[PDB]
């Protein structure tokens with residue numbers, strides 16, 4: 001029968017076209033792939049002014065707000081802070097949230113099991129005017145975090161500029177690239193603020209723009225803290241020119257339940273010696289955490305994967321040809 | 330023919346079971362799989378009181394023993410420390426381990442090639458009544474690490490608590506999750522310590538329990554340092570409800586031969602100005618290093634992988650669909 | 656015909672030999688593969704003496720130039736620094752680069768949209784003799800960072816020592832390995848210098864030697880910054896003894912165009928209290944950044960991968976029982 005024969009021939013031609021389009025045009029099986037080694041450097045430029053009641057104006061700069069301060073891919077920018085200054089090692093009342101004693105005999109000398117603020121003397125000196133707390137030996141005065149300022153102190157972090165220098169290298173092809181590849185110049189770097197469509201290759205990002213692209217409001221994320229992840233993807237084709245190699249920036253917002261453990265916060269202390277006494281300033285900072293992850297793949301033409309895909313080709317052609325079985329008749 | 334015909338049908342049935350089974354039910358083919366982007370924040374709650382001769386009681390808090398102090402996957406908690414206070418830049422005798430000279434002519438001006446402690450002034454100054462060491466320009470009180478306290482100074486480290494907040498997101502499927510599962514609540518967090526079976530979902534870990542689960546003794550580790558790696562695995566099937574996606578915490582102990590370089594140690598310094606002179610306190614800390622690694626995969630139903638698996642099963646059937654006929 | 660039959664048998668034998676040699680031996684199909692969990696700790700030994708005009712000699716030790724300072728895998732070693740001491744929050748003329756005002760009227764009270772240096776007071780105060788800049792409220796001495804020193808201040812980093820301790824663990828195989836191997840001992844550790852041919856297992860690396868192996872000049876990198884990545888690869892077969900497991904150290908240099916943002920630089924401040932006043936020393940450091948990335952795989956003999964590879968075998972065998980049979984058409 002001629003009809004079944006021409007149908008079999010059409011099926012064979014369809015399989016041929018599908019394989020030719022898939023193994024080469026679509027999947028690029030003729031190319032071999034390699035993974036990059038990448039290093040990310042971060043530079044924050046911006047100035048913040050905080051004027052707390054009872055304290056003079058305080059200035060925060062690149063060395064102050066960025067916590068790693070050595071170019072780490074994962075970093076934190078200060079958005080709000082609670083400060084306890086002039087902490088000395090002495091005996092003072094503990095934070096009421098830890099424990100409260102109605103009488104001195106109620107408390108017992110020792111250390112708390114889960115949340116310990118110090119060694120309890122057990123004499124119960126008053127913290128509040130009405131209620132008393134256990135006297136501990138620890139840095140005094142104890143930090144209070146019950147009151148969180150609704151307006152963010154470093155509320156201008158929306159307009160701080162972040163410069164990301166990402167240097168990637170493929171050792172299999174021995175090709176080194178950078179996010180400023182062949183388009184950004186000495187004048188372009190000055191006036192480009194990253195937009196999704198307007199200026200994608202520019203490495204100067206606005207923190208507020210990044211937070212808004214991540215899908216989170218900057219005010220609530222700055223008040224209590226947050227996490228924003230920046231991913232730089234490198235899709236490089238060695239067959240084409242190196243100018244075509246361009247990074248893609250993706251911004252995601254990592255959030256959880258607001259009721260339980262809202263935001264990102266951490267406590268750090270600055271130690272000093274004043275008047276012959278060693279003291280410290282303790283800052284509890286709620287800041288947006290920026291984690292930068294770079295992943296990329298480069299493909300270059302090679303003869304061995306080409307021959308492998310061609311053989312896979314001959315193979316799939318075998319499947320189709322074997323089917324006829326002498327025209328099943 | 331039936332003697333081997335039923336065997337041929339049985340072989341075909343086995344092929345079909347393999348297709349719709351190990352390739353379809355297990356080793357999910359009816360789902361597309363995506364990796365996550367994860368960020369971890371570590372918070373240490375604990376306080377240590379250390380009595381040191383010549384320095385008095387010292388209080389170590391969250392900001393103190395956490396050297397990163399900001400929150401990172403790799404962080405070290407102080408377990409023991411050797412303190413050299415009031416280091417000032419002036420000519421002084423070097424450490425006896427560096428070099429020993431009976432006379433001043435033995436030492437030569439310059440800098441040591443191996444383990445340089447300072448610039449030699451070409452003179453030898455007695456370190457003590459016993460031995461003399463070459464005079465070098467640097468921090469005047471040289472740190473002596475020969476004596477390590479057998480009882481850990483921060484031995485209360487076992488009970489320091491660690492809260493690990495891990496936020497993951499699968500972008501292809503747009504699902505965001507956190508280690509604080511819906512089963513976990515404020516009242517639970519007020520009184521929970523993680524246990525593998527008793528409290529699997531708890532986000533609060535005891536450092537001593539973590540070190541014990543890693544396979545290392547806490548005392549010997551805190552004496553000289555150690556490495557414990559905490560891996561958080563997220564195996565979530567998005568075909569079910571989102572409540573059924575949870576984290577698995579696994580603890581590993583990264584240790585080596587104690588004869589050569591036992592434990593983990595480092596030196597960090599605190600600089601200050603006293604009496605108009607710049608000084609510093611140098612701490613050589615042996616602390617446990619905790620590394621947080623998060624890897625996970627999420628699978629969601631999709632038409633294209635299902636059709637690809639069905640097509641592969643056809644051809645897996647193809648092999649057997651052959652006939653005993655010339 | 657005997658010729659077609661012997662050709663068919665020869666092709667079958669060739670396919671069998673290929674299956675035996677490539678699937679089983681080349682890629683080790685009979686061995687299941689597992690990844691590792693790795694931790695890297697870095698320790699720097701070296702001292703630098705930097706003498707600045709008008710200031711006392713400065714000594715830099717391991718605690719000084721190692722910025723993370725907790726043995727972090729990604730770390731930066733100080734190679735050059737520009738220091739502004741005794742900065743106290745006060746009204747000062749802004750850095751000329753940010754702005755140049757001819758008169759007070761030109762200055763506008765407020766902030767700068769890009770690269771803000773302080774809060775403008777609306778006053779044009781003389782930064783120096785010839786030109787004036789708008790007054791700001793910020794640290795008192797603005798960092799004039801124009802003159803990066805040509806000779807590297809911490810040039811003694813050309814001879815520095817770095818000890819990298821890498822501990823890996825395969826949990827599927829429950830095997831723990833370390834960069835320190837049976838070949839390395841304390842007597843060896845004392846005087847060992849890494850040399851990719853002479854001492855491959857040496858754990859003590861020279862920073863200058865690492866930068867040279869990366870493919871970058873040390874002096875240029877120390878002048879304005881650089882990036883060198885050290886990768887530790889653990890590729891071993893656990894069928895043999897664990898002694899055969901050897902790490903491989905590879906060095907790469909991550910560089911860019913010198914015209915656009917050359918090198919790596921970062922600014923950090925040390926805060927203190929002097930005479931009852933909070934002050935700070937600001938340092939702009941150009942230093943080589945070292946990043947440690949560990950990737951490894953271990954293989955152990957198992958019966959399930961062997962059976963799967965065998966099954967894949969008849970798969971190729973059947974293919975040939977019909978391969979040349981479809982070539983047999985003419």
Ligand SMILES: Nc1ncnc2c1ncn2[C@@H]1O[C@H](COP(=O)(O)OP(=O)(O)OP(=O)(O)O)[C@@H](O)[C@H]1O
Pocket residue numbers: 043044045161162163189204770800915916917920
């Ligand atoms: N976060 C940022 N925001 C805005 N501009 C930046 C940022 N980081 C760098 N730049 C600009 O890119 C150029 C090259 O960056 P580089 O890393 O060399 O900074 P730099 O020149 O060392 O710093 P400075 O400009 O303060 O001297 C600089 O002229 C600077 O103006």
Ligand SMILES: Nc1ncnc2c1ncn2[C@@H]1O[C@H](COP(=O)(O)OP(=O)(O)OP(=O)(O)O)[C@@H](O)[C@H]1O
Pocket residue numbers: 114145260261262265372373374490491492518533
């Ligand atoms: N390491 C820990 N051990 C025990 N409980 C913790 C720990 N970290 C956080 N918590 C508890 O989880 C709750 C929410 O966590 P979160 O990180 O928001 O703490 P917080 O609100 O900043 O309070 P705190 O200032 O006491 O850390 C807090 O009430 C706290 O008691």
Ligand SMILES: Nc1ncnc2c1ncn2[C@@H]1O[C@H](COP(=O)(O)OP(=O)(O)OP(=O)(O)O)[C@@H](O)[C@H]1O
Pocket residue numbers: 474589590591592594698699700816817818844859
């Ligand atoms: N950067 C380095 N260069 C050369 N040798 C080193 C370096 N770091 C450590 N070592 C040597 O390798 C060994 C590592 O052991 P470890 O670092 O635990 O010793 P340690 O007790 O800290 O003594 P040290 O403070 O002298 O290193 C030590 O004997 C030390 O002498």
Ligand SMILES: Nc1cc(C(F)(F)F)cc(C(F)(F)F)c1
Pocket residue numbers: 068072073074401402403723727728729
């Ligand atoms: N050792 C180390 C250091 C950093 C840092 F120094 F860059 F923060 C990050 C990481 C992380 F695991 F998060 F990638 C590890």
Ligand SMILES: *[C@@H]1O[C@H](CO)[C@@H](O)[C@H](O)[C@H]1NC(C)=O
Pocket residue numbers: 096097128129130146
């Ligand atoms: C009593 O203590 C609480 C904290 O638990 C505090 O909010 C309140 O202001 C105190 N009352 C005073 C100081 O009168």
Ligand SMILES: *[C@@H]1O[C@H](CO)[C@@H](O)[C@H](O)[C@H]1NC(C)=O
Pocket residue numbers: 155156157158159768
């Ligand atoms: C950020 O945008 C402009 C400066 O570019 C300014 O008008 C605006 O007030 C800024 N917003 C904040 C919150 O500082």
Ligand SMILES: *[C@@H]1O[C@H](CO)[C@@H](O)[C@H](O)[C@H]1NC(C)=O
Pocket residue numbers: 183184185187188
């Ligand atoms: C810098 O590059 C941009 C595009 O990348 C271009 O528009 C601009 O003219 C360039 N600046 C020059 C050539 O001065």
Ligand SMILES: *[C@@H]1O[C@H](CO)[C@@H](O)[C@H](O)[C@H]1NC(C)=O
Pocket residue numbers: 512513514516517
């Ligand atoms: C807290 O969480 C635990 C975990 O299962 C649960 O059993 C308990 O009922 C919860 N308590 C409240 C008050 O929600």
Ligand SMILES: *[C@@H]1O[C@H](CO)[C@@H](O)[C@H](O)[C@H]1NC(C)=O
Pocket residue numbers: 751752782783784785786
């Ligand atoms: C004064 O500062 C300007 C900056 O605009 C600089 O060009 C000039 O050389 C400086 N003059 C002196 C004497 O320092």
Ligand SMILES: *[C@@H]1O[C@H](CO)[C@@H](O)[C@H](O)[C@H]1NC(C)=O
Pocket residue numbers: 810811812813814
């Ligand atoms: C390193 O040592 C060699 C040999 O002593 C010397 O020539 C070179 O100048 C040194 N490099 C420094 C001190 O930076």
Ligand SMILES: *[C@@H]1O[C@H](CO)[C@@H](O)[C@H](O)[C@H]1NC(C)=O
Pocket residue numbers: 837838839840841842843
């Ligand atoms: C030290 O290690 C080296 C290198 O493996 C070796 O040749 C030497 O014999 C070792 N010495 C001792 C005392 O173990």
Ligand SMILES: [Ca+2]
Pocket residue numbers: 271272273274601602603926927928929
């Ligand atoms: Ca001070």
Ligand SMILES: [Ca+2]
Pocket residue numbers: 068072397401723727
């Ligand atoms: Ca760090």
Ligand SMILES: [Mg+2]
Pocket residue numbers: 097145
């Ligand atoms: Mg609290």
Ligand SMILES: [Mg+2]
Pocket residue numbers: 426474475
């Ligand atoms: Mg020693």
Ligand SMILES: [Mg+2]
Pocket residue numbers: 752800801
């Ligand atoms: Mg400048």
